[model samples]
Target: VESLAKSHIEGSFTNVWKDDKTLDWYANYEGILWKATGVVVITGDETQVYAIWVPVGLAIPENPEYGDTPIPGYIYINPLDGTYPPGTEQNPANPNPSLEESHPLNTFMFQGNRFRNVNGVLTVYTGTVTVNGKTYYQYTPVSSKAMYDAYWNGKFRDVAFHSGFNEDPLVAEYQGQLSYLPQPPVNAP
Candidate 1:
């Protein structure tokens, strides 16, 4: 839990954990990185221990007013010796040798399915161009008319469909939290 906050969210757990109905975590940057509160402890009878993140984009440099500035993205600083993976997709100019380990949580190399402890912003790429059977995919923050911008900044989706995935009733368990609010009563008509 604490590890993810540090490496992924780029912060640390609150010296005082929030023991509300939900296990609130007072991150160093608080609402800056993610607005996740109380990581449930997944367990049948004991402490299952699990984490959930909502809106993991604000951490990315403040939306530039002119254009893509520093383009604050993800940075992996291995706590084992420093130096992130040369250039795979993420982790370019990035570690810790004295920290005892390295960037093992999030690497964007396979994303969530790849590992835990960290989750990167999800970008929905749709527009595809097929050149002689080679379908080249396109990107968008959402809007079918977006300028093909492909980075999950947590906002600017012209279409809801492009916002996230699936929806539910119990607090609306879907992709990016808060994306799809809980559905109304089961039946109405």
Candidate 2:
């Protein structure tokens, strides 16, 4: 758990590791980078762990004006060599590595999948729709109208759907956690 928070989320975790139930994580997706605070964690057994990030657009920047400023989303400096990934350069010229499509977690590549932020965690559905003669892999959220713009910064669609339709181990853990959530009690008209 400590290692997961250290790698995914920025800042110091040792101090708040026990007190804070939710850990903050840096999200680099959908062409924008933002910090997701108060994120919940779900660990089903010891096999896997998942972090649930709510709809957060502003917080870390604090000052509203700097909200649009393109800055480094999150830099994962290697503890051994202190060297981060190529695109995730901390240089102010172009701090946001996501713009260069090398923001550690390659999120843009999985944009093709149907994306939906359900209770903060990203859920993707891919239904193979056979249209005319071509078999098209149709992906969508529940909305008929496009809700693609409605993206929560840290919504890790790229991470969850990184392996195409196959759910990531962390994602599967989230699914397992979801199953245990309070379901609709019995049948109600």
Candidate 3:
């Protein structure tokens, strides 16, 4: 969510959504809708690299009404660069990072949704981030079309699967960790 919002500041695109119960939102660039999700990797000037996953998908109407203003689908895994932590860089050594290292994972976004329903048990997990003031939360949802797509295209294709969707539930694991690097010395330059 933090990454999406920052994209706006970076002039990457515009994000629009009504702060209501509806999960209807749109992200447009030159009037084109993008669809894909993958890991957001960030690298510091010193060459330290980190990654976080993102899942982008079409808006679902039948799903449970999400919280007001469905959190922007764009998320910056590294909170230090944007409106997160409110005075710190996600990677202090590289206070002002570039798009190459912090760009979203567009490879998985183009892939369609990955849904699996087994015996009335459906599991849809997607990478998500929430930013409230200086605090940020990152996790995969229990069931989200966005997440399912990421897990399938990004992880499933690489790993082997046993039972099909009808017999077993799809499982997604988000094992990234958060780091708090100290701010760079102001006069180091």
Stretch of 10 with least lDDT, candidate 3: 46-55
For candidate 1, write residues 1-189 as lDDT tens digits: 233233332122222122221223222233344433332222121111123333333342332012222221111111111122322254422111111122222212111111111133222222344556564533211111111112234222322222232222111111221111111211111
List where candidate 2 sits over 4 angstroms from the true fold.
1-126, 141-151, 155-184
lDDT of each: 0.23, 0.25, 0.26
What is candidate 2's CA lDDT for residue 97? 12
Quote the lDDT for 132 in model 3.
Answer: 50
Residue-pair clash count for candidate 2: 0
Provide TM-scores for the models. Answer: 0.16, 0.20, 0.18
TM-score of 2: 0.20
lDDT of 2 by residue, 130-185 (tens): 45655443322222111222233333444434533433233311121122211121
- Candidate 1, superposed: residue stretches over 4 Å from native: 1-123, 141-174, 178-189
lDDT of 3 by residue, 1-189 (tens): 223322221212222322111112223333233321233322122111112112243333332121222122222222111222211343122222121222122121111122232222222222233335332222111233333333445544422233433333333343222232222211112
